[model samples]
Structure formats: C-alpha cells, structure tokens
Target: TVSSFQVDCFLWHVRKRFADQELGDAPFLDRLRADQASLRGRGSTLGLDIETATRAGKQIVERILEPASRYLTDMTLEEMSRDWFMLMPKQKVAGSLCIRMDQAIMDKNIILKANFSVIFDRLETLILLRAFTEEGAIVGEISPLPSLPGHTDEDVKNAIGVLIGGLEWNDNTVRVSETLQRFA
Candidate 1:
C-alpha cells in the first residue's frame, strides 16, 4: 500500500533514531545526513523467534508500529501489515534468517540469508544479503537487490538470477552456470 520511496524515507528516519539515541548520542539530522550518504554508497522477510514475537514484538507494536503510522504519512497499521519490521528479544538468538525459497531448483541448494542481528544491545536495522552454501557455510555477501513491496515469485527469481549471475566459479569448485538459466 506504500510506495518504495516512502518506505525508504521511513527506514532512513528509523535508522537515524536508533543509531543515535538508542545506543549512542548524535544529532538526529546530522546522523541522518551521514546515513543518507551511506545509502548512496550501498543498499526481509518477517521472521521472528518466539521470545521476540511475544516480548519485544509488543514493544515494537507500541514503539514502532503506532508511531510509524503517524510519522510516515499515509501509512496506517493496516498497510503496515503488507510490510513488517523485525524485532527480537534482546538476549535471544534468532531461528532462521533465510527467505523460504519454495521453488524447486533440483540442482543446487544455496540459501539466501538476511544478515541482521539486533538481538544484542547494538541495533543495526540495515540488512545485508548473503549467499550460503548448501551445508550452511557462507559463500559470499552482496548488497541486496532493489527493495520494493509486493515482490512476487517472479521478482524473487529475477533477483536470484541476478545474484547468481554476478558470482564467480572460484576455480570450478562452485559451479552455478549450469543451472543459472533456470532462474533467468
């Protein structure tokens, strides 16, 4: 229900607030400006643990959801359902950060992971994408694909295609070219 630009600005505001007062202190606009610069340099799913869903989840609804409705104009709690922000209990570890790729590849088993851990005192909401091997080892990390709401399976397939399309074979040890066309 919300446009991508609005989502981006809201994220920008939220990132600025958290980085400054939540963990440390800095001028809001000043910090925002720097983060904006970083946005120029680089760029979820709704996954939650039980502890987070029950505990910090409530606080997120209270602190984040309620306020975001007013702060990010034209966004309501109803529309927020279409896009979810993550929250985890401060002391707990998360279950799975990977997107559920239900499509059958029949060849390779790589996991697309969102690398974000705010379970500790440190809160960095900015998510980084990672490619993990079938055995759960990380292959490489890359900047996320274009973020837009209403990402269909087609969008996901294209994104994955792009992700794999950019990868190197690493001396033929990790071969992706054979099956990359399936995504394309």
Candidate 2:
C-alpha cells in the first residue's frame, strides 16, 4: 500500500498544503512551483542510487531529526536548536528567522541533490512559521519560541494542535518515519 509513488504523492500533498497558504513576503506558491520542478528533475537521479539516497536521507534525518522530533514531542524550536543541537545557519536576515541546516556534511564526501519531497517537507516548516507570524518581518526574530527552552509543553502542544487541526487527513507519521528510518 505504501509504494514509492504513494510516498511521493503524500509528500506532494504536504507540499500543496503548505503551498496553498500565504506565508510572508515571499510567495510560497511560486517557491513551491519552482521547487516541484527541481524535485521532479532531480528525483530520478537521486532515487536511482538507493544506498546513497538512504545514506544521504539518514544524514539529513540525523541532522534535522532531533529538531523535528523535538518539535513533534515538545514543539519548541529553541530547545531543539539551543538545548539540543543547533542547526547551522544556511541563510539569515537580521531580525528575521535564520534558515538552518546541518553542518556535518562539509567534510563528508557526499554529493547531495535533495529531491522535491524532501525540499517540500523542509519548506513546509518555514511556510508554517510564516503562517503563524503576525508581521512577515518578525518571522525569524523569535528563535526559541517554537523550541524548548523558550516554550513550555503547553506551548508546543498548542502549536502542534494548531498545525494538525488544519490537516485534511491523519498525519503520515508512519510512512514518514519509515522513510526517515531508512536514512538511519
């Protein structure tokens, strides 16, 4: 039932869910369109190398998994970044939220070309944040609000509640977990 195509479809659904929303100055729809094109173009190349895909996926998961899991478990970005392991700043605008990714791959001999689904999943978080922001400019100003140290269990619970409340289907924790686990 959980074929690769189904997985891809689910990922696309998630992408569309986030894409449909207006999240800040940048049009998520446009970004999603471009990203989808890129993903379709790259998925074949990346998917061909199953071992490499698994390894790369695992590495990505390792880097973001704790943060993501922490977000799932506690729903705090500060705890995920500060108390746990901080994702390196891939890009940042002062007073705005920093875009972060793992730094461990700098030395690793891996040529990573992220597929569309992965990009969609990652960007979904940003879109979600943007959706939550009152003023687009202040989106990144508060780092720890979603993470642990700055937020209480109640805060995370509320955030998750908000995120899940809008879902059209039951969360795909099982398929997503399996996909990420393959990376491990």
Candidate 3:
C-alpha cells in the first residue's frame, strides 16, 4: 500500500521529468491549449451518451480508469482500491469523494470490467504532451522569430503564409478523416 505522500511525490517526478524536453515552447503551447479548450467545449456539448462497449463510450470510460490504473501500475492500488475491490483489503474509513462504498464500488467495477485501460493510456499520453508543451513555452525555450538575417518582414510574413496555406490544404482535405478511420 502506498501513502498519499508517495503518490504525490511520483506525480512530481513525472512532471519534473517532462519539465525540460517537451515543455519548453510558448507559442506552440498556447496554440495547443486553445485547441484543446475548443475541443473540450465542443465535446461536452456533443450530447454523446457514454456507453461501456462502443468506442465512443470507451473514451468516457477511460477518463474514470486513468487514476486507478496509474495507482495500480505504481503498486499503490492496494491502498486505494479497498473501497471498490471486493476481494482486496477494504478501507475501514473513506477518505474523500464522499460517496459510500456501494456507489464507489459500482463506479470502479465498471471501469475495470470495461477494459478501458487502452483509452486511459492514450488520454494520459495526450495530457502529458500538452503539459510538456505548455511548460516548455513558459521556460522561454520556444519563441517566435521574425526572420533570419537579411530577410525582410514582408518576406517572413509571406513565408509564414505559405506554410499556413500548405497546412490548410492538407488539413481541409480527406487526409484527416482517413487517419481517424485507421483508428476506428
């Protein structure tokens, strides 16, 4: 069984490990956050009902699975899973979440049984990437350069325009849909 202090320490370590490599670019980090917020807002309003079996449902399931999976993988599950696991050592007293054993039990069982570990893993990866990018930007490792030496402002602007245009062409086409279909 792992103490809460240990769990916190590990999370700190994870954050520190990624603090240098991926979390160093500012503008890119801002862009990523803006994109993520927009996506989350849209997702919340999509009226998509979460199910346990379908891919759509799996995404929701994964959110619930992530913390527990992290705990288990870190060998802290025995300490945390008591309120849920019938076969494991149970906690005599509840910590937070306020819910009774009956409620928490069902919630945990559903996530474990749904085998949503893959979904949680994927979400965690995305979260880590976002965190890394944001932290990188804050550290001033990433910056917006006007242009290389001897380049005019207009020339740099035009270069950016061309780059964006190329992106639009690829992004607006069927390429993205094709990529997503591969996952489906």
Candidate 4:
C-alpha cells in the first residue's frame, strides 16, 4: 500500500517517549468534588433527571472524540497492531540550517513541531515551522503542507527564530538532524 502514514508511525513511536504526562488525578478528583458539592445542594445547576443526564453525558463523551483526538487515537491503534501490517526499516536522513538577521523587527511568535519517520528505507527527522505572525504584517510564508526541503539564508534564520525565542544574531546557525536517519 502506498502511504506516507507508515513514516508517521515512527512518530507514533516517539510519542511513546512523551507518555501522557498524566494530567494528575486533579481532573478526576474535581469530578468527585463536583459530585459531593451537588449532593450538598451547592451544585446541580442543571435541572435534569439522573437517567436523562447520563444519556446526554454519554452522548457528550462520544462527541468529545473530535477530529484531532480521533486522528491520534486511530494512529495509536495502528501502532499497537504491531505485526498486523509489518513495515520494514528503510533509510535515515538528516539536514540542518543557518540564518541571518536584519536591523529591527516587530515582536512576533513562532512555533515548531517535529515529526520522525522512516521513508524509502531511511529514518528522517523533520522539523516544521507551523506559524509566524506579527502586529499586522505578513512577511513569512505560511506553508500549507510539510516543511520546505533545504533552505536559503533568510528561511533558515526564520526557522531558527521559531526554534529559539527570538532571532537576533546575524550569520548564526540553527540545526535539526535525524536521530532516526533511515538506518537499516
């Protein structure tokens, strides 16, 4: 089957490292507290029967499966399937970038998200610049798809700006290399 998803599966593996930093028992405990408060006549702002509330609550639980959650959960199930549809190792690829700055720029915000994968027998680590913006100007390219392959001077610095807090140093370098470079 032709797919880019197999590589994303590698990211699924990396996600294993992030291991849901348990939101702590605070959330669950809050639910218990709410129940107690309701029993104490301090809550129950909703005027509904237990069965009706339960049915609606169940519906809400199901509805909470937003597109983002569904996507992650689906990917996770595939990762768990292990031997169901095997994917062999391929290649590992890595790349880095360098940048420069100008006089004075406005205050802006940028974000980066990394995805690791195996493509064509190669392990690849791709850092993406998701967004960039300032007061009321559009100076940078907001890519619709994935990352740009290779970089010139300005692009490299913009990406670096996203990596670090702000981009100030001129003729400096920023890098990202694949820890999973398609090592067969």
Candidate 5:
C-alpha cells in the first residue's frame, strides 16, 4: 500500500520545482496535468490520498490524483531499469544497476549507480550504464559505445536483447506488483 508521506514528498518536489520557476495557478495545474499524462503513458500510478474531498484545495489535488504524476518515488526499480535500458542499451552486458540516495544534492532526488562490463561477441559487445535524477534526468558521464572497434550502438543492443529474451522469468507480475506495493 502507498503511504501519504510518499505522496507528500512527491508533490512537495513538484510544487517546489514549479515555484522555482515562479509558476502558480492555472499554469501549475496545466504542468501537473502534463506530468500526469507522462506518468500514465509510461504505465505508472501516483498513489493519491483517498480521504481528500472533492474541490478541496481548489480541486488541484483531485486533478493531480486523476492521473498521478510519474514521480520517481512511485516507480519500481524494474520500471526505472527498463527505461534506462531503452535509453542506453549498451550498459547491461556484464553489470547490474543500482539506485543511490544523494543527500548532498537533495532529500528527494535519487542517483542511479550503474555498473557494466564489456564483452566480445561475434558482433562485439560493450555495455555502460548512467545515473539519473528524480525527474529521470541523465546527469552522469557515459562513454561512447561505438568507440570500440567494430561495434555500433544498434549491434550491441540487439545482442543484449537476444541474451535477455532468451532468459527465463519464473516470477510473475503479481510478485512484482506486490513488491511495488511495499516499495511505494
């Protein structure tokens, strides 16, 4: 089950960002809606507070809950990992990914610490990972994949995909969903 504290933290970050830009009123709501859509498009939920009444806080909370913002706090590591893989395919050859909480930057932001190893296949394979912030911003330095001899970005990713697709997943969605429920 999702907690109110998590929602408060997520909304606090969003509100803080909006306030930093000197945004309020309708603009704030519009931006929120856009974020909500993005969250939904990515197959995520907001974990909105249920006790909140209709029209409370000028219905902004209601609107925000209708489509929850795809905040990092509400996302699973698997989801984040998939997103990262889609964005950077060469990073999963021989290393696992990790999430780090960076107190120096902010209480709310997360740092993804990734580790990857290089491999030599017929097509030549090299993988590297990247770090992202709470808003899923790429902030870490990444080595170019094609720098390796006889390797292209596409080739490495296709090889990685084939390797992953061949693996067996005995665990079902219910197990992941259960883990997600506890994590948020």
Candidate 6:
C-alpha cells in the first residue's frame, strides 16, 4: 500500500518512463510538475536530503561515460543506459558533446605539451579551457603560436618566460676569476 513506498522509489519509476520516451522531454516536464503539485496537495513532506539523488545520478552518468569514452565510439542506449534521462534531446549547448570532445581535448593537450615541452603539462589542467568554451565565437588565441589548435585561460606561462628570455643560459660566465663570494 502507500505506506510501503517512498518518493525516491516513485522517482526511479518516473525516470524510467521518461528514458523510454513513453513521455517525451517536454511532456516529462509537465508530468513532473503535476506530480509535485499532487504531492503538495497531499501534504507529503520530503524526509531525506533531496540532493543525494541528483549527485548519485550525475556521478553515475559521468563514471559510465569515462570508460565508454575510452572504448569504441558506438554503444547502444540499452547498453550504456537503462534508466531515464537517456532521451533528453541532444544538448542545446554548443560545448557539451562530451565523448568526441574528450578525445579532441586529449589530442590537443598532447600537441600543446609536445610544443611547449615540460612547460604546458606542469600548469593547471584548465590552462587551455578557453578553446573549448569558445564554441559561439572566436573568443581568444594563443600568441607567437597564435594558431592554437586552441586557446587558454592564461598566456602560456612557459612561453611568457621565453618571451622575457627566461629560457636562455649564461652566455658569459660571471666571476670568471676566483673570489670568496664568487669563486670557481
């Protein structure tokens, strides 16, 4: 009876129904709104921290994606996902097409590291984020090497060092004579 079930159990089923597209995306929104209204009408109180469900769902989806991104490109909806959220329309955002995007990013990072040597990899991973986020327009460029396979948040730190002549060695030795402070 109603005494035996919880809101989460109910949400699990609702999520499935949407994944099946038994209700499409827009209709899913409507049904969900109506259910919330019905719950409010009944004065059903939420007993647990509601955020748990969202975190669990998002983390699981990302974990699933990480391994699949390493594997071959084609995996079935049934194979990768059995729950709902599967049928959500493709991202309206220009930036979120993740698996392919991930591969491209990996390739670009290798090129950056190769070109900059040890310099690029030592910096933060987000160093080159602007390139990916610039989907709507050409937001930035990497200079000297302005033909960025992409761009970054800060100027290339090592290249900046190079620009200021940090990469050079002592062309003429200082204290070429022996002294207590500057000997040999």
Show model 2 residue runs off by greater than 4 Å: 1-15, 21-26, 48-184
Output the TM-score of candidate 5. 0.18
Task: Tell me the tens digit of each residue's lDDT in model 2 across 44-162.
Answer: 65564333343444444445443233122212444233332324423332222233333322222211111112232332222122111112111111232244233233343343333
Residue 60 CA error for candidate 5 (Å)? 73
Residues 9-86 of candidate 3: C-alpha lDDT, one tens digit per residue: 333334443535765567655655565465445445554322211343334334655344441121133323322222
Best by TM-score: 4
- On the 0 to 100 scale, the lDDT of residue 1 in model 3 is 18
Candidate 4 stretches greater than 4 Å from native: 1-31, 35-43, 63-125, 128-184
TM-score of each: 0.22, 0.20, 0.17, 0.26, 0.18, 0.18
RMSD of each candidate relative to the true structure: 21.9, 23.1, 31.7, 19.7, 21.6, 21.2
Tens digits of per-residue lDDT for model 5, 14-105 = 57566567646787777777765654443345444424411233344445653222222323456335532233222233222222212223
Q: Please give the lDDT score for candidate 1.
A: 0.38
* Arranged by lDDT, best first: 1, 5, 2, 4, 6, 3
Supply the global lDDT for candidate 3: 0.26
* Full-model lDDT for every candidate: 0.38, 0.33, 0.26, 0.32, 0.36, 0.29
Considering TM-score, which of the candidate structures 1 and 5 is the better prediction for this target?
A: 1
Candidate 5 stretches greater than 4 Å from native? 1-110, 118-126, 148-184
Report the lDDT tens digits of candidate 6 across residue range 135-164: 221111222323334433243443332212
Pick by TM-score: 2 or 3, better one: 2
The deviation in Å at residue 142 for candidate 1 is 1.8
Candidate that beats the other on TM-score, 2 or 4, i.e. the better one? 4
Task: List the candidate 6 regions with Cα displacement exceeding 4 Å.
Answer: 4-24, 44-184
What shift in Å separates residue 155 of candidate 4 from its native position after superposition? 11
